[PDB]
């Protein structure tokens, strides 16, 4: 019950021959996995992180200038030429000035002059790579037991560290069984397209590609304190003013500008090891040897109490928190939902089974009433604790909310929203291949895009669905209009 | 007036090794507004004067070389070097910058063995 | 680099806010409109390139619209 | 690229005051708040007094509180310390230390003077 | 931020060299030559939408060059 | 600026997105639009930074 | 029994202290340092001068 509170969690209810329900795991949103006989737990990717990280690619943000060497020759005849033109440090530049007696070449005319400065860079930006071998993942567990101090508390869990060598491991939960973990990490973010730009204390997360079409000047990338950089022409700017001869002049420090323009990137934690906190992962839960505690115990007969009031979540979870006044410690807790004084029993417990576990120690129940009028009661005899409550919604606008939270689901997710929750089946199979087949040509498409571009765009093409009457309008309207409006209304997560 | 205790007095290393020198707090210099860690780390090379090398507990200054790294969190606070080099002779005086007056370690001493 | 090669639409998407995705969401938006403020006068010579150009009311429009995109950002 | 250079340093009899002066240059300066630190010779780094970007608040040691006065001549791009009632123990190679470029601390250093000194001896 | 709102084209010119008029000239156009090498797919977007809202050649091609100069410009 | 100069256009200078001031040659400026530097970022709906 | 003050809206008010500070046809806009405080309603307009 670490899950309650963060608003971004969704509740997995299926199960399958063998009992495994694969899940996804996003970083932002804590899964809940509800089944028949097995209690109901909750998991959250807590932290992604890698460790060993190489340089790949170093690239310069501002330099110094010095050492300003000029030569020029007679007009009309050769070319400028300066022995420090060859050294790898030193930037050069050929223009033509207009010489004459007045400069003391023989002849009038224009005539080259070179200048060469020395480029010696400050503040580099260091682009790491990361290998799949060194990529870890930490998953954290907790069975829904009713302990008093368990609702959203973060700290609290049970770790189980995944990594591509290992990737099946299981935790062993405490009273509870072990939750099997068989989970392939190579999906998730492609880390083969990932350079980190450590770049004074600021990691990011960028393509591969774009990093590489930085026009700022690189270094050979190795580890090196003098090391030398490729394209220096554009950090320093020879300014030929008139003609009568040029000066050389330092860029300046290109920090405001990167940070402009990694304005779509996504940043990560680097300090000591550098724990990325965006991405997602897919696993498989196996739950065969998973069981619930107590369900021998006998059932209460006795007062309940609450000690704090119920209060409905956002997603529809009310918590109730009560505490036992009996004498019999090791029991179970009775429940009981009517509609109108009329035993339907339209509620669900997403706990298991809570049961006490101590005379007067708080128990809290998180239960699911339905979308009316609904008393709730827990102990049996002329002294049932009696929660009315009443839930504020429709049906309909449930499936509503659904459908928008799938598609958010489907648009942050490549095709792994077809395998979220995915319990076994064909069906989500043949979904799962046409959604990918669609969506990598819908990208290769609308690779690189603008928020706004991608509106504007969509707008134009249902239009033009709109107007072409040969069955066009049917395909080109409803996949690439709509589509490409709510993508292009959702990119700048 | 917050005490700063630093556990090695002297560091004699061989080039191409690792090194360790600690600083502990007699306080923990964790600014609650904010949650960071306000410790520094300087070195004075002989015959110079000081310079800036992580400039909090572990986001190394600029210009610094690449293997100069810090650690701890609350008072137990590390300065790792990972290839120790000729240059690295000096004087490691640690620094919390929590409360204005500021009091520098005793600061440490690194040779080559 | 130079702040015109942005991480916008290319690469990952994830549910994390990407780093300065509010403040930037309008920034060319922004600037096109600042632009066109400050120069009316390409507003009346694209009206008139469009309505000089392949007119039919939906490539008048678009075409008009497409270029009083183009030339403020491209600047 | 900023340089802080010191100036004033020079021996002195104890008793004698004695006004030191940082000269800067290579940034703004009415913009950074200034420092003066000092190191006896063989002992560790002791800072002494800390003048913030505003002129008017200053702060001092506990150790040299109430001898020493800080003043900044922004307009000529240069800091001034006071030196008051000298002891023999006050003689050590004065610093004059910027304020951090980048960071949260309202009062950092990153760049240190080349040094001076100054000897209070009979 | 700043960096998309270059001086250029303001009015006052005159015949001293400005700054960076060698090297920021190409700067808008190596942007787009970049982008389009990067991104090849919406070449063949864009060819679909001049095709499917051009009726005349001349509009193909203004349509296409536009589409083409306005994405990597936007973003 | 930083020991250089350019004749820019009046408009262009007080168009550009940068935090300005009076320009009194006073202590402690005060400067408009301070939100042009300073950029937060909710992380996960959990806090700011 | 109990209730909590979700937003206080008022009806009266008092005007305490007053400055203006004007600029030059030609050289921008005016600016006020107690224009950034959050308590001083401010408001720009247009005179000859
Ligand atoms: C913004 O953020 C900065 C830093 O993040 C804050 O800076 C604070 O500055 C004040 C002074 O301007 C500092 O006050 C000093 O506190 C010392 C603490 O000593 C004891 O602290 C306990 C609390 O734990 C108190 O209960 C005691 O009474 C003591 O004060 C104090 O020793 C010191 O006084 C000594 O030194 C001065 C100068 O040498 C002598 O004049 C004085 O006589 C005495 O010997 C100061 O009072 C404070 O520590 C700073 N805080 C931090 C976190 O650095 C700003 O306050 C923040 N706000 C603003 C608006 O800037
Ligand atoms: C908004 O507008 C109001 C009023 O319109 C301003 O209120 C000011 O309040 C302060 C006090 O908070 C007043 O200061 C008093 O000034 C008295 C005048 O004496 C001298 O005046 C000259 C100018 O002629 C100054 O240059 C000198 O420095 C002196 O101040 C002064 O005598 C008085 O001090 C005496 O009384 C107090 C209280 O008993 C004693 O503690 C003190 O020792 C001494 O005996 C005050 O200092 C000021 O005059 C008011 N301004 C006016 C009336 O125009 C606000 O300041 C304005 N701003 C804001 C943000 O509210
Ligand atoms: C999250 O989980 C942690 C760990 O379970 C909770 O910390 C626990 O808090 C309780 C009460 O605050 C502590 O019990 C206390 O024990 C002492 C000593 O016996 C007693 O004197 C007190 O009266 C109280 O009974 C318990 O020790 C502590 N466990 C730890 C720290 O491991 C925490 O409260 C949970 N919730 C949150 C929001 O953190
Ligand atoms: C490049 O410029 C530097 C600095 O201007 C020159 O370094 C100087 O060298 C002379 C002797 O040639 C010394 O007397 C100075 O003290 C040096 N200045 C310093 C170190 O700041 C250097 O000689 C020039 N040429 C080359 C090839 O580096």
Not at chain 1, 435 to 451: D, K
Request: hydrophobic share 35%; net charge neutral.
């Amino acid at each position: 019950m670490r899950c309650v509170g963060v608003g971004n969690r969704d509740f997995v209810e299926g199960l399958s021959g063998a009992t495994w329900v694969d899940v996804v795991l996003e970083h932002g949103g804590c899964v809940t996995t509800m089944a028949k006989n097995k209690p109901t737990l909750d998991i959250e990717l807590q932290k992604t992180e890698a460790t060993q990280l190489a340089t790949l690619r170093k690239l310069c943000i501002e330099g110094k200038i010095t050492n300003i060497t000029t030569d020029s020759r007679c007009p009309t005849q050769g070319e400028a030429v300066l022995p420090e033109e060859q050294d790898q440090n030193y930037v050069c530049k050929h223009t033509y000035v207009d010489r004459g007696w007045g400069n003391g070449c023989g002849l009038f005319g224009k005539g080259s002059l070179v200048t060469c400065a020395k480029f010696q860079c400050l503040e580099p930006i260091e682009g790491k790579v990361v290998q799949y071998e060194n990529l870890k993942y930490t998953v954290i567990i907790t069975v829904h037991t009713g302990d008093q101090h368990q609702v959203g508390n973060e700290t609290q869990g049970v770790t189980a560290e995944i990594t591509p060598q290992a990737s099946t491991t299981e935790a062993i939960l405490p009273e509870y069984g072990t939750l099997g973990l068989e989970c392939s990490p190579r999906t998730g973010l492609d880390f083969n397209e990932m350079i980190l730009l450590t770049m004074k204390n600021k990691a990011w997360m960028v393509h591969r590609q774009w990093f590489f079409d930085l026009p700022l000047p690189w270094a050979s990338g190795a580890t090196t304190e003098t090391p030398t950089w490729n394209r220096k022409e554009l950090l320093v700017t020879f300014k030929n003013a008139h003609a009568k001869k040029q000066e050389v002049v330092v860029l300046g420090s290109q920090e405001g500008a990167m940070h402009t323009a990694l304005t779509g990137a996504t940043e990560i934690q680097n300090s000591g090891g550098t724990s990325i906190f965006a991405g997602h992962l897919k696993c498989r839960l196996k739950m065969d040897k998973l069981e619930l505690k107590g369900m021998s115990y006998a059932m209460c007969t006795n007062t309940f109490v609450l000690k704090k009031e119920v209060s409905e979540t956002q997603h529809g979870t009310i918590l109730i928190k009560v505490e036992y006044k009996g004498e019999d410690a090791p029991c179970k807790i009775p429940f009981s939902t009517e509609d109108g004084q009329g035993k339907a029993h339209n509620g669900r417990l997403i706990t298991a089974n809570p049961v006490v576990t101590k005379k007067e120690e708080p128990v809290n129940i998180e239960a699911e009433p339905p979308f009316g009028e609904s008393n709730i009661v827990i102990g049996i005899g002329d002294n049932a604790l009696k929660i009315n409550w009443y839930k504020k919604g429709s049906s309909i606008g449930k499936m509503f909310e659904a459908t928008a939270r799938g598609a958010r689901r489907m648009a942050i997710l490549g095709d792994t929203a077809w395998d979220f929750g995915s319990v076994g089946g064909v069906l989500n199979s043949l979904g799962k291949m046409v959604h990918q087949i669609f969506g990598s040509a819908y990208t290769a498409l609308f690779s690189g895009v603008s928020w706004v571009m991608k509106i504007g765009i969509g707008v134009l093409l249902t239009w033009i669905g709109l107007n072409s009457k040969n069955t066009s309008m049917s395909f080109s309207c409803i996949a690439i209009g709509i589509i490409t409006l709510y993508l292009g209304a959702v990119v700048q997560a | 007036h917050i005490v700063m205790t630093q556990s090695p007095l002297s560091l004699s290393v061989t080039p191409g090794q690792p090194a360790s020198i600690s600083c502990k707090s007699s306080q923990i210099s964790s600014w609650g507004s904010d949650g960071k860690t306000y410790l520094y780390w300087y070195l004075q090379k002989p015959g110079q004067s000081p310079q800036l090398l992580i400039y909090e507990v572990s986001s190394r200054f600029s210009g610094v070389s690449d293997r100069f790294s810090g650690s701890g969190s609350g008072t137990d606070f590390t300065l790792k070097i990972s290839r120790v080099q000729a240059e690295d002779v000096g004087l490691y005086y640690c620094m919390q910058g929590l409360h204005l007056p500021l009091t520098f370690g005793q600061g440490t001493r690194l040779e080559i063995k | 680099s130079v702040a015109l090669a942005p991480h916008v639409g290319m690469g990952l998407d994830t549910r994390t806010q990407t780093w300065m995705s509010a403040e930037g969401a309008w920034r060319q938006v922004e600037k096109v409109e600042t632009w066109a403020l400050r120069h009316p006068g390409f507003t009346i010579l694209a009206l008139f390139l469009a309505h000089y150009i392949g007119t039919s009311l939906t490539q008048k429009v678009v075409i008009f619209i497409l270029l009083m995109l183009v030339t403020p950002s491209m600047t | 690229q900023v340089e802080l250079v010191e100036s004033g340093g020079d021996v002195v009899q104890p008793g004698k005051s004695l006004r030191l002066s940082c000269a800067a240059s290579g940034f703004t300066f009415t913009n950074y708040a200034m420092h003066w630190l000092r190191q006896a010779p063989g002992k560790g780094l002791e800072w002494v007094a800390v003048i913030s970007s505003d002129v008017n608040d200053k702060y001092y040691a506990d150790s040299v509180k109430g001898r020493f006065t800080i003043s900044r001549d922004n307009s000529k791009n240069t800091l001034y310390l006071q030196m008051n009632s000298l002891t023999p123990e006050d003689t050590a190679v004065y610093y004059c230390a910027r304020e951090q470029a980048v960071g949260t601390n309202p009062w950092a250093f990153d760049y240190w003077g080349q040094g001076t000194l100054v000897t209070v001896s009979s």
